[PDB]
Amino acid sequence: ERDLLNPIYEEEKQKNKFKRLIQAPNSYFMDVKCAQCQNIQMIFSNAQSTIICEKCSAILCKPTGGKVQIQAGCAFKIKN
Amino acid sequence: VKVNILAECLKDLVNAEKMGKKQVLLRPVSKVVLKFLRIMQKNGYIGEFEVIDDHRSKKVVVELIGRINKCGVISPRYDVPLADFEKWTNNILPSRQFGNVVLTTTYGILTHEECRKRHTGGKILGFFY
Amino acid sequence: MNSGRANQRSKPMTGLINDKKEKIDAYLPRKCDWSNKLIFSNDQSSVQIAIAEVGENGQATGSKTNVVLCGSVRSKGEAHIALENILRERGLYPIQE
Amino acid sequence: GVGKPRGIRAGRKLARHRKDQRWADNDFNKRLLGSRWRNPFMGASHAKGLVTEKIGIESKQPNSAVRKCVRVLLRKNSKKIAAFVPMDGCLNFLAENDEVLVAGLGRQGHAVGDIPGVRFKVVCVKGISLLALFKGKKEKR
Amino acid sequence: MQMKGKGKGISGSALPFKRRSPKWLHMTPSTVVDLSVKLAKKGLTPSQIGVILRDQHGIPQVRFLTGQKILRILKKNGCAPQLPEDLYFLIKKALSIRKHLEKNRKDKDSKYRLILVESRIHRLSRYYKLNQKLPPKWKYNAQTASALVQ
RNA sequence: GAAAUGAGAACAGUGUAAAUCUCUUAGCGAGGAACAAUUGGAGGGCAAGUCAUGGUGCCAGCAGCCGCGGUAAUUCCAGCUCCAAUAGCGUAUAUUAAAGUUGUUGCAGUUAAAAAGCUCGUAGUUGAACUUCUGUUCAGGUUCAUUUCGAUUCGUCGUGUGAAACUGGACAUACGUUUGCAAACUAAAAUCGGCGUUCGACUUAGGGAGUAAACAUUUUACUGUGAAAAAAUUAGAGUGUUCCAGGCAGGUUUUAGCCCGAAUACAUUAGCAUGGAAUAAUGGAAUAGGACUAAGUCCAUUUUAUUGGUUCUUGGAUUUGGUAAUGAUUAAUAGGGACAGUUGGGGGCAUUAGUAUUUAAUAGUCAGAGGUGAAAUUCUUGGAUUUAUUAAGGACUAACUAAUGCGAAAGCAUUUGCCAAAGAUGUUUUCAUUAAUCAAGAACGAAAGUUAGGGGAUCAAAGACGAUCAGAUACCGUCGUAGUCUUAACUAUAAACUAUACCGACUCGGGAUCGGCUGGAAUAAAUGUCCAGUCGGCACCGUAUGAGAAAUCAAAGUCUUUGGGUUCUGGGGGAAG
Ligand SMILES: [Mg+2]
Ligand SMILES: [Mg+2]
Ligand SMILES: [Mg+2]
Ligand SMILES: [Mg+2]
Ligand SMILES: [Mg+2]
Ligand SMILES: [Mg+2]
Ligand SMILES: [Mg+2]
Ligand SMILES: [Mg+2]
Ligand SMILES: [Mg+2]
Ligand SMILES: [Mg+2]
Ligand SMILES: [Mg+2]
Ligand SMILES: [Mg+2]
Ligand SMILES: [Mg+2]
Ligand SMILES: [Mg+2]
Ligand SMILES: [Mg+2]
Ligand SMILES: [Mg+2]
Ligand SMILES: [Mg+2]
Ligand SMILES: [Mg+2]
Ligand SMILES: [Mg+2]
Ligand SMILES: [Mg+2]
Ligand SMILES: [Mg+2]
Ligand SMILES: [Mg+2]
Ligand SMILES: [Mg+2]
Ligand SMILES: [Mg+2]
Ligand SMILES: [Mg+2]
Ligand SMILES: [Zn+2]
């Protein structure tokens, strides 16, 4: 027995992006702080490209299917 | 693709009462789907129901009493003069006692029966008993 | 949503009543409480459970509550969850010390 | 859905389909192809004719017997006909060259289970119902 | 799932509920409109521009922020990409196929694949022409394709 | 045993142009072969013989289809007795129903007949969701309910409540505007009376409401009435002696006149009038321009007697300025594109191996090899088979290779390198119905086969031989041509198989898989392993108060509780593809 209108948070957290009721994504946004310049740039959780630090020109993120690996030790807050 | 979601929603629901589901989630929903729903509700077939706001085209959840025996639509929604009624009443309904053949009119949507009251009716929509 | 549920059990169940407001149906059949289906005249696998009423001291009272569970629901291994819920409804499954 | 299309705008389709898929019926295909007119009677129910000769035919499968039959010449049609003479002594009345009235046996096609290629019955001799000649108190020439 | 009696699935993308613009971000519609048209001037697809504004400058959904869909913004600012991504690209690969086919005049799987791709293009033309979003005398044959190559 | 009585036959009367007949009616008119029932059956279907009946003996014949008949026939011939319809009853042929056996409703399509081998694709058919919802109050009925009221009787009305919904109003940013009518009430001003005001009657203004015309993009569709000949069908009245049926007839007791009738409905399809709010299609402002409003200007113009000239009313054209929240629904667990790592025996060019089969060289011996159940043609000391090295050549990709992978299907497995392509996953990217299926019409489609060249190692249709057999131009054995390989043409079929059309939504349990992704743990920091999710892809296990003829089916399911969209196919068998 389960209510379909007041579903558990966990359950919906497991389900597939499009299966959840209100239906929302997983992607998020993050302020990255270069390993040098320090500049704080916003990068999308699913960047589809390599990202440079507009200050110096360092490498911050490498693209993948879904996740974006962050180059070396750079900082990252999840804006939400 | 999809078509007459009223049909999409309807059978999904029948499959419900038939399987003994405790409640149902209808995915693609419209004014029609909802009107039909409150008409079944009003006549006492389905229970309380909630419409969730899918920012695209709402999702509805209908509680299942356990009195729905069958509720479907009718292929092309033929036109039906008031004279064409008994034909369909003896046709679709399991008796001269559960008269529920929903139709579309200019006067909105009425029960198989209400259409005789208002005296107009028009195109068939669906049925439930 | 208790809503619909409370309202179906609401009034009494009475079979085919004629103009002369007479009941005619040879007998009024038992109805499955968790499903609201009809219990046959020969439904082998449908059962009526008898549960007893207790009186605030660990003692038992000469009072029982019945639960009708149709065939199919009992067959899909529902019963245990079905009953455990008809008992929530009639305020009873949760058994406080 | 099933094969047939359920559109309110697709009546034409269903219509032509039925007119077509309908040729699969022999009863239909039969009368529709003026077939009835080509048989020996030319559609007709009965036909007059002259006895060309009384011949006998052998029974088929589990039966063994000498069937009485007359080879007739239909009038306006002018065809050779195989005609079974009914009851017992019957052929004893049919004199060669007399006028005979013939009709079919159970739906024009298969002959009685017993007979081979015979499709007709003989009902009149010189314009005298056979039954009549079969029962003494009736008629004879 | 288009030209596929057998293959079919779900790539992704589901716009979040909250129809307003993210909190953290501050940018009068105009601010974006500049980036958008600037970026566009460099020669970008509204398809690609939007990608930047999400990966680079945290703007999830330009439409939600401006109240304007990219292509529209662009068209209002003269920076309109003549021929739509849709058609453009299909025709691009449609062409790439032809070139490859030449030196491999025997590669049959490719003859087939092109047949499908050329088929699509005729489907877009039918469409884009009907929305008076492309001159009626438009015709992709081989000259329409090589015409864009110059 | 006597009464009864039409057939029958009749003077009269009626009727008729005459005549016939009917009808009324006197004399005459019924008791057993009579004053009269047939026709067609009696195994089953199909109602009726269990006769120990006679004749016939697969003969004569019956039989609609099963089947009867060869010496003891329940189906023949006939007797008897029975059954069925009965002034009727058989038969032949076409046709209706049974025929959900031509199917829109309402079929079938794995194996019974039936999905096309497979994809593309204009006609056709089919198409996601949003746009006054809603509330309050009044009123007219309607119903239903009633610990209820007043009336009547052999079953209704009125009254009250609650309720629902209808309606119609009103009002609430809310389906209209003008007109004329009527008007219903109110706010002022006037007049009139009493004592500026308390009040009253009577005027202007004001919209509902109340009609008619003008408007709400255009149809579908539905309401309703106008139209849809008569006769016929249904059907009211109506004792033609009932009835068919005609439309007449009812009361002389108001009889030189009375009473009453010849009604009504249905009529779909296309046209007309008209009420309309749903579904459905269609449309309005996106280059811009639209809208409303004021003025200016230009063109056109009615009435002013008429012609000019001005003006002006009325249409249209622009410019400007003002007003208005100026004008583009979401973004389909639909579809198309962009992008990102990645995956695959997908494909096309290159390239590249590896053993093996042949065949050749270089050496090495020695009498047998090879083949079968046995042997036999076959090969061999001008050296076989054999062993080592090596080479030429054409095909082939082993073992890993499995209910595992990719490709529309046919089909696809050595390395490496290019060439254009693809799924799935990932997306807070765009585009926003672009789509589903499809006659026409095209792209493919192992083999075998065909044309013209290549190539020719192995196996091998035809063929040549051995053996086996009673027979062997067959199943074994020895050889061998076409092919098998390839380039370029052509051929399109195959148990082209899951014998199960594609798109879509649902519904049981369970682990294991292949590809992608996201969390986590250990090592370790691995293009690895494991735990847990989850999309998408083969497949399996268990099970169904779901399906079936069953085998069986998680779909072959959500179909008598018979209807998501679309294409193709079948209609007893054989002759026949
Ligand atoms: Mg037989
Ligand atoms: Mg899908
Ligand atoms: Mg007389
Ligand atoms: Mg007597
Ligand atoms: Mg008799
Ligand atoms: Mg007989
Ligand atoms: Mg007899
Ligand atoms: Mg006998
Ligand atoms: Mg008969
Ligand atoms: Mg037939
Ligand atoms: Mg108003
Ligand atoms: Mg390759
Ligand atoms: Mg050999
Ligand atoms: Mg070699
Ligand atoms: Mg593999
Ligand atoms: Mg290998
Ligand atoms: Mg070809
Ligand atoms: Mg050759
Ligand atoms: Mg021998
Ligand atoms: Mg050989
Ligand atoms: Mg991980
Ligand atoms: Mg896993
Ligand atoms: Mg079946
Ligand atoms: Mg199974
Ligand atoms: Mg069906
Ligand atoms: Zn830096």
Side-chain angles (χ1 to χ4, degrees):
Chain A
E1 65 121 315
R2 294 197 160 193
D3 188 307
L4 198 32
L5 313 189
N6 290 306
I8 317 171
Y9 180 79
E10 317 327 308
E11 314 302 305
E12 298 284 299
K13 212 210 172 194
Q14 285 162 50
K15 288 183 185 171
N16 189 89
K17 192 174 172 190
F18 301 171
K19 303 284 184 173
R20 314 157 180 182
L21 286 178
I22 288 187
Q23 181 225 65
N26 315 302
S27 48
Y28 43 94
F29 290 77
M30 46 209 283
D31 287 60
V32 192
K33 308 163 198 174
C34 173
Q36 313 169 310
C37 80
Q38 292 308 307
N39 185 35
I40 283 204
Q41 298 188 312
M42 290 230 77
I43 302 174
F44 173 61
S45 55
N46 298 182
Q48 323 190 317
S49 45
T50 306
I51 2 187
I52 315 171
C53 139
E54 271 207 53
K55 271 203 176 184
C56 64
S57 187
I59 317 169
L60 292 317
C61 300
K62 283 302 185 176
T64 314
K67 70 186 160 186
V68 190
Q69 157 204 57
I70 301 182
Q71 291 298 296
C74 291
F76 71 152
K77 174 195 172 185
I78 41 166
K79 281 293 183 62
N80 71 297
Chain B
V1 194
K2 272 176 183 148
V3 267
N4 186 316
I5 48 238
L6 170 61
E8 275 269 316
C9 280
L10 272 172
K11 283 176 195 153
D12 276 310
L13 180 81
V14 182
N15 286 267
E17 278 271 50
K18 290 195 173 178
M19 273 295 92
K21 304 177 200 168
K22 330 148 186 182
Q23 59 179 59
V24 199
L25 167 61
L26 314 185
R27 188 215 314 184
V29 172
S30 68
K31 288 287 183 174
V32 193
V33 185
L34 306 165
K35 200 161 182 182
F36 198 93
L37 268 188
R38 189 183 166 192
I39 301 179
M40 290 179 71
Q41 183 180 65
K42 156 186 172 176
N43 276 73
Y45 280 71
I46 58 182
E48 170 219 70
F49 79 84
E50 191 174 66
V51 179
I52 320 169
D53 189 284
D54 166 323
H55 262 318
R56 270 150 248 168
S57 25
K58 45 292 141 178
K59 291 191 190 177
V60 183
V61 187
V62 181
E63 180 186 302
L64 300 191
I65 310 175
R67 196 277 219 86
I68 288 186
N69 223 316
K70 174 62 167 268
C71 64
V73 190
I74 269 182
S75 21
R77 298 167 168 179
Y78 311 67
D79 307 68
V80 167
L82 290 175
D84 265 54
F85 274 52
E86 320 64 56
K87 166 186 170 182
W88 294 100
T89 305
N90 298 281
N91 239 31
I92 309 166
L93 307 160
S95 266
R96 204 57 228 79
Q97 307 277 23
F98 316 58
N100 297 305
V101 190
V102 189
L103 296 221
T104 292
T105 341
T106 320
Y107 290 29
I109 295 188
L110 318 185
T111 297
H112 120 74
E113 188 54 288
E114 284 168 45
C115 306
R116 327 202 70 163
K117 154 83 174 182
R118 285 276 211 170
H119 192 93
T120 285
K123 309 186 70 179
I124 293 192
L125 219 215
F127 64 74
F128 70 104
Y129 50 71
Chain C
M1 302 310 98
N2 42 58
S3 49
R5 291 233 66 178
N7 320 139
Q8 64 182 305
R9 295 188 174 184
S10 163
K11 306 162 187 179
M13 171 176 248
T14 271
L16 225 51
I17 326 161
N18 63 306
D19 299 297
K20 316 306 163 186
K21 296 278 184 163
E22 304 170 55
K23 279 180 180 179
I24 320 182
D25 276 275
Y27 77 116
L28 291 197
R30 296 183 303 184
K31 218 178 61 166
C32 177
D33 306 308
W34 184 183
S35 84
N36 203 310
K37 164 213 163 192
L38 307 177
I39 276 63
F40 270 56
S41 303
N42 72 82
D43 190 311
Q44 296 193 67
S45 12
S46 64
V47 60
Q48 195 174 76
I49 292 172
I51 321 169
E53 175 196 66
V54 190
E56 274 295 297
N57 300 297
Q59 337 115 311
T61 307
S63 309
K64 318 170 186 179
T65 295
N66 296 307
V67 230
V68 177
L69 291 181
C70 67
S72 45
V73 167
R74 199 177 121 69
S75 180
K76 308 174 184 183
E78 218 71 308
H80 79 288
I81 191 177
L83 182 57
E84 166 175 57
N85 256 268
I86 309 180
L87 306 184
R88 298 282 185 167
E89 297 196 310
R90 313 184 197 182
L92 272 152
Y93 177 65
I95 296 173
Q96 257 166 50
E97 173 50 59
Chain D
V2 200
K4 312 304 183 177
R6 290 159 186 152
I8 353 53
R9 308 220 139 199
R12 141 164 299 144
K13 159 74 178 179
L14 306 195
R16 196 55 259 178
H17 187 59
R18 255 293 118 278
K19 291 188 177 177
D20 284 62
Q21 284 301 309
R22 200 158 152 241
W23 282 101
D25 188 319
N26 308 76
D27 315 325
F28 173 60
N29 188 47
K30 196 180 199 169
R31 78 154 181 294
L32 238 188
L33 290 189
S35 175
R36 181 198 178 202
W37 307 112
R38 300 185 166 185
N39 71 54
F41 281 42
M42 289 170 65
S45 164
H46 301 297
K48 286 185 174 183
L50 327 172
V51 171
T52 287
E53 73 194 74
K54 51 276 192 179
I55 293 175
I57 292 198
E58 59 224 39
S59 185
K60 297 168 68 281
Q61 269 296 296
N63 308 317
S64 180
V66 175
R67 292 308 175 213
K68 330 195 79 323
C69 314
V70 186
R71 177 162 297 152
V72 189
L73 162 62
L74 300 174
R75 279 325 197 82
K76 182 99 171 180
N77 186 51
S78 288
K79 295 291 181 177
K80 64 87 186 177
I81 260 187
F84 176 104
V85 192
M87 315 208 90
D88 232 74
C90 288
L91 178 30
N92 292 320
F93 300 149
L94 289 163
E96 192 165 309
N97 286 187
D98 292 322
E99 248 183 56
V100 178
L101 206 34
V102 292
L105 346 171
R107 198 62 173 183
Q108 178 79 307
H110 300 188
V112 187
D114 186 297
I115 280 53
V118 178
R119 308 197 182 185
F120 305 121
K121 179 178 175 185
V122 175
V123 194
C124 293
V125 184
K126 307 163 189 167
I128 307 172
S129 67
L130 272 185
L131 204 195
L133 299 179
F134 187 62
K135 303 183 171 183
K137 304 176 183 178
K138 312 291 181 179
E139 289 171 48
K140 55 183 173 181
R141 271 197 163 180
Chain E
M1 231 279 96
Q2 187 77 314
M3 303 173 112
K4 248 170 181 147
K6 264 185 181 187
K8 56 188 177 176
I10 318 79
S11 228
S13 188
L15 320 183
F17 197 93
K18 289 177 181 170
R19 298 174 173 294
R20 64 169 186 287
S21 297
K23 297 191 167 186
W24 72 71
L25 176 46
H26 316 288
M27 271 185 88
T28 311
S30 30
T31 325
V32 177
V33 182
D34 264 290
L35 270 168
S36 60
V37 201
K38 277 184 182 176
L39 288 170
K41 282 188 175 178
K42 269 192 171 176
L44 297 186
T45 321
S47 302
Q48 312 172 312
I49 297 175
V51 181
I52 279 181
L53 296 176
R54 175 241 291 151
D55 288 312
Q56 313 284 57
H57 335 306
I59 299 162
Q61 212 66 14
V62 182
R63 165 173 155 260
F64 267 44
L65 182 164
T66 332
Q68 273 286 59
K69 292 177 188 170
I70 306 183
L71 205 303
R72 267 189 184 169
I73 291 177
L74 291 180
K75 197 217 171 187
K76 285 194 169 195
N77 287 302
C79 175
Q82 187 93 67
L83 180 66
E85 331 88 77
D86 285 278
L87 202 57
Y88 179 83
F89 284 120
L90 280 187
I91 305 184
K92 174 181 182 175
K93 68 156 48 191
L95 234 49
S96 297
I97 277 67
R98 291 188 176 180
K99 278 233 176 182
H100 155 72
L101 292 184
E102 270 338 291
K103 301 203 169 182
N104 300 290
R105 193 206 164 201
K106 202 181 171 198
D107 180 358
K108 296 212 161 189
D109 191 297
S110 286
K111 291 182 186 173
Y112 179 66
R113 287 305 159 55
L114 169 146
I115 295 177
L116 311 197
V117 174
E118 295 201 304
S119 192
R120 299 196 175 82
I121 291 167
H122 285 299
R123 289 176 124 213
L124 257 294
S125 293
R126 288 275 183 180
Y127 175 76
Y128 277 144
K129 288 188 192 173
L130 302 194
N131 295 293
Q132 290 179 301
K133 276 192 169 186
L134 167 55
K137 61 173 186 176
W138 179 226
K139 299 164 192 170
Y140 160 64
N141 45 51
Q143 295 186 57
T144 245
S146 59
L148 305 176
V149 181
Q150 305 178 304

